[PDB]
Amino acid sequence: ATAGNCAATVESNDNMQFNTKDIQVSKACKEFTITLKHTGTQPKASMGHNLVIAKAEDMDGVFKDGVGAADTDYVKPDDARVVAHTKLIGGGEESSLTLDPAKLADGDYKFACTFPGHGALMNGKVTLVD
Template sequence: MSANRAIVLIAGLFLFPLGAMANDCHITVESDDQMNFDSEEIVIDQSCEEIELTLKHVGDLGVDTMGHNIVFTRAEDLESLAQDAMQASEDDYVPAGDDRVVAATNLIGGGETTTLTLDPSLFDGDERYAFFCSFPGHWGAMQGEVRLVN
């Protein structure tokens, strides 16, 4: 490599840091048989055209006994939506047509994975958002904050 090419390459690394060249538009969250998410925060990068959110259930128990999903809602609606979701068993515990639901993954059991494509424009920067598992009894332990970044 010539000296001039090396200088251009080094200068390019300082002018365009690797982190600035790609957005974090792919998110993976794991859940388990002990009613845990591996993250208490999901970061939504609003500069992404879309975000691919993958939920992995790393446990062994089936969807009927230890099902998990991720439901996004405004923080102020979390408790009331979680209470109402327990009655929505025919809809995988996500009340159909409920405007408090911003987005939701499918309900999965141990060893399963589901992916949701999110439109970041669903999240208003002036609101606070939360996520939770709507399977009955899980939301108290399985919830977290959504942080919006540009």
């Protein structure tokens, strides 16, 4: 499936997991939407999740700058090394982002939760595909 997916939905729970560790972005899409749904009962301050997509080579700086942006859902208003980012969502809440697929051609991109203590496990691969 490539010509029938301009959006994706990721489910995160308070058991510390994503329902997918691989996201394939179609270059057939002008923009790609990713919707995150936190299917749990824990509030964002106790077990919050976000989905940040950035260049893997720069992913370290993304997490680092994310921790410094605690007031802004652990996402820093910048979007230079970061391609897209959701907000922190609690049990029942959802957040979404829109990214330019053609910007993922720079190399290997990853998606992860920039919540301190989560990124070590809550991360995967996001690849631009045809």
